[PDB]
Curated annotation (Swiss-Prot), chains A, B:
Lineage of origin: Eukaryota, Metazoa, Ecdysozoa, Arthropoda, Chelicerata
Record Gene3D superfamilies: Cystine-knot cytokines (2.10.90.10)
Keyword Secreted: yes
Principal subcellular localization: secreted
Similarity comment: family membership: Belongs to the coagulin family.
Description of how the protein assembles with itself and partners: Coagulogen is cleaved after Arg-18 and Arg-46 by a clotting enzyme contained in the hemocyte and activated by a bacterial endotoxin (lipopolysaccharide). This cleavage releases the peptide C and leaves 2 chains of coagulin, A and B, linked by two disulfide bonds. Coagulin molecules interlink to form a gel.
Role summary: Coagulogen is a gel-forming protein of hemolymph; it hinders the spread of invaders by immobilizing them.
Protein's recorded name: Coagulogen
Key words, A-Z: Disulfide bond, Hemolymph clotting, Secreted, Signal
Annotated tissue distribution: Hemolymph.
Assigned GO CC terms: extracellular region
Other facts: The sequence shown is that of coagulogen-1.
Length: 175, 175
């Protein structure tokens, strides 16, 4: 594999920040579209409920930044739901990405519309010091899982659920 | 009177995982307060922090463990930023304090929330062998400096910056 990389949400070498800067015009388009969704609802204007009528949001739009805690994205909370015997120290950061590369490696725009009231978050848990030695013979390794998040299709002006790899833990594996 | 063994951030058997009064009851309260900031903040970027949108954190949240280097707490990194002519031998230890005494002598809980992505580190540089003769007429002296760290005010259960003395070096104080 020449160019190979799993790529976790918010992954970035320079202190894990932003790679490129999405056009404000795009953010504008998204805000508008999300507002359109909220209005086609109207009823139940108390919270996320304004989005709960649209099929895609119902399917994968529930990683609400307001409710998602870090433990919800630890590997033990994703199938197979098992705990690590030994896990290395973990660096945890909330992630609210505007872009992501799917499981298939494609580039996608992940929907974030703070003004409209729709924000998606998934806390990332990575090996604190990369892959250092840890067992009596082990190695610190990044484990991942997969989350589905609402993305925005620029062409067809439509929403869609897509799969992204998320960093859930750092088990000390025997290499 | 003088003392060969100076007192620094992380000194005395009180600073530990459990620690003095820093009950798992307090710890948890702090963790959730930090998570709330992460959840409402969201704002992030390279060479930044997700906490830089909150006023207390933008002011004194820069001793985050992932960015801190041992030399960042050496005396020459604090005003008047001057180097020593002769410095006695130093013992450098990492320090991630859970409580401390402010420059005004008050006890304060120093925020440490590993699970929400906020840890504070200030490496202590102590006189390896204190007070012993070093120069012609000098005596090895613990040099302290002042650092501001995010604290948790019990009363108003919120965040506040406070000033703490930190051990930055051990100059041979001759004359």
């Amino acid at each position: 594999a020449d160019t190979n990389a799993p790529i976790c949400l918010c992954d970035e070498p320079g202190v894990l920040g932003r790679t490129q800067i999405v056009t404000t015009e795009i953010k504008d388009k998204i805000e508008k579209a999300v507002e359109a969704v909220a209005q086609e609802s109207g009823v139940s204007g108390r919270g996320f409920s304004i989005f709960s009528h649209h099929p895609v949001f119902r399917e994968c739009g529930k990683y609400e930044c307001r409710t998602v805690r870090p433990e919800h994205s630890r590997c033990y909370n994703f199938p197979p739901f098992t705990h690590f015997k030994s896990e290395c120290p973990v660096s945890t950061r909330d992630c609210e990405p505007v872009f992501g590369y799917t499981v298939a490696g494609e580039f996608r725009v992940i929907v974030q519309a703070p003004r409209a009231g729709f924000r998606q978050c998934v806390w990332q848990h990575k090996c604190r010091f990369g892959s250092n030695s840890c067992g009596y013979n082990g190695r610190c390794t990044q484990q991942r899982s997969v989350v589905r998040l609402v993305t925005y299709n620029l062409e067809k002006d439509g929403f869609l659920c897509e799969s992204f790899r998320t960093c859930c833990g750092c088990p000390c594996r025997s290499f």
